[PDB]
Amino acid sequence: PGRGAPLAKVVFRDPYRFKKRTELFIAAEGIHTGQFVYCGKKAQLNIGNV
Amino acid sequence: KKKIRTSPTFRRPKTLRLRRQPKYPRKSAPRRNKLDHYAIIKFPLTTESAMKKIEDNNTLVFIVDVKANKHQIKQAVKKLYDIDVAKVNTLIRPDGEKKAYVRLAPDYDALDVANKIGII
Amino acid sequence: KVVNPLFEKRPKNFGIGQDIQPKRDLTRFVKWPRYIRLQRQRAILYKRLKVPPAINQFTQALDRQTATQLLKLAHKYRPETKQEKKQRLLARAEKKAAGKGDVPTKRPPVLRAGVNTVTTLVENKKAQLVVIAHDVDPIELVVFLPALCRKMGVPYCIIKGKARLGRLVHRKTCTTVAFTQVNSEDKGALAKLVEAIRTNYNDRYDEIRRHWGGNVLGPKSVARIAKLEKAKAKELATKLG
RNA sequence: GCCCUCGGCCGAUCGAAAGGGAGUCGGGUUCAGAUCCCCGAAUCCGGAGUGGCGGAGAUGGGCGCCGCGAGGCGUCCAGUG
RNA sequence: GGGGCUCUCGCUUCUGGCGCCAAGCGCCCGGCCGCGCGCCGGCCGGGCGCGACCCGCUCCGGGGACAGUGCCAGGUGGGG
Ligand SMILES: [Mg+2]
Ligand SMILES: [Mg+2]
Ligand SMILES: [Mg+2]
Ligand SMILES: [Mg+2]
Ligand SMILES: [Mg+2]
Ligand SMILES: [Mg+2]
Secondary structure (H helix, E strand, O other): OOOOOOEEEEEEEOOOOOOEEEEEEEOOOOOOOOOOOOOOOOOOOOOOOO | OOOOOOOOEOOOOOOOOOOOOOOOOOOOOOOOOOOOHHHHEEEEOOOHHHHHHHHHOOEEEEEEOOOOOHHHHHHHHHHHHOOOEEEEEEEEOOOOOEEEEEEEOOOOOHHHHHHHHOOO | OOOOOOOOOOOOOOOOOOOOOOOOOOHHHOEOOHHHHHHHHHHHHHHHOEEOHHHHHHHOOOOHHHHHHHHHHHHOOOOOOHHHHHHHHHHHHHHHHHOOOOOOOOOOOOEEEOHHHHHHHHHOOOOOEEEEEOOOOOOOOOOOHHHHHHHHOOOEEEEOOHHHHHHHOOOOOOOEEEEOOOOHHHHHHHHHHHHHHHHHHHOOHHHHOOOOEEOOOOHHHHHHHHHHHHHHHHHHHHHOO
């Protein structure tokens, strides 16, 4: 509410403890549910990657 | 070679807490219980409604201390009248006095108890 | 040969995104309490900043051999404890009632302690060796002592531990101690100490006066400066020759 | 009691008789009270250390046997439906 | 062969799965029976190290003697 952009709820793995992390990214146009996004230096050039 | 920090947070270490071992009591003697049984049971109610409760519901109606709960009223009635009671209902009157309806156990007759108390 | 076939290795790899990281040592990356951070940062600041020579001279102290041998000499001259004083006072009272009289009986040489006592002894030139702790926290109690001892000619040294000097004088912490006259059997040991102390402290007082401290950068800064220097050096080397 | 290991509601506390929030209904009864009293039917939560009773787990299979046989005996093997 | 020399001193991209509380190895300390010659046989437990490299002085990064703050000075200032 109050924002024109959709928000993407994205679930990662905590690399240090057994848990699932939930982030609230700003949805880039094209991404869909069930899609894998990759965040990091070695990530590739795809829509939604960071 | 074994002191390790697997967490990046420093928490306050758990120290020893002693229990109080005072060198003198702050109160010389414990103050006695003012809300004893005679304080709890002030006087019975002798109105038309109270009499009808005695002769119908096996219930004695009392005016009790406003600070006494149902357990205290039950135990006080049991001790200072030598009767067994089933349940206690309690209201506070519009004048501020607490009223207790004490139903007696089936083997006790509230009429006879009221006669021994002297409130018939 | 007889090992159970059901036993097998189950190696886990700790690459990125794979099996979660093991519980490893994280002391370097701990959110420490403010007081721990403050004392460590103060230790770092005393290495960053240009420390004046009058404060920097206390970082030069005795080595293990000389400090231990000096403390061994000084252990023979510890001040008497309260129990020892009360017992010699009782013995003195009984023997005085017996007929011993005053009889000063050569009050034994003792170790004088305390900065005011020691500085008065130094001013009167009644001190034969001064030992100064290196870690007096309000360090103005001692900054004048090396220069004063040099001017008066009394040999002085700096030792590691106001706590060690305190244990020498049966207290928690002593700033400085002084050797007044010493016993005949210990005169040789005191002279042997005083000569090395004199060479290491009073003789080189002129360069102690000028030896500034600190002014050293952190390991990261030093390393990156070194790698920049090496880059320019290697390109210059390929240029030359 | 101490030690080892684990332990972020990461923020006290307050804030709704219309929000969220387990589980009570029928009949009778007073001058004035009743889903609260009486009668009769339920129900939720909490407790039970010495364990309250049952039922479930859990009571089978093989082989040597005894025994007219059934049924019992003994060595093994299973058994968190 | 192989070192001064380099990117690596990396382990995860076709799936709307799973993933923690160490397997393995090595060194020990107990209790048990016992060849009854000790590194000596087997059984019930516990500890440590490597697995999971070493050292280091700022947690990591971005600014930085500027910004900012304190005091004075000039300007602007119907916002009051
Ligand atoms: Mg009530
Ligand atoms: Mg917390
Ligand atoms: Mg509240
Ligand atoms: Mg409500
Ligand atoms: Mg009404
Ligand atoms: Mg005006």
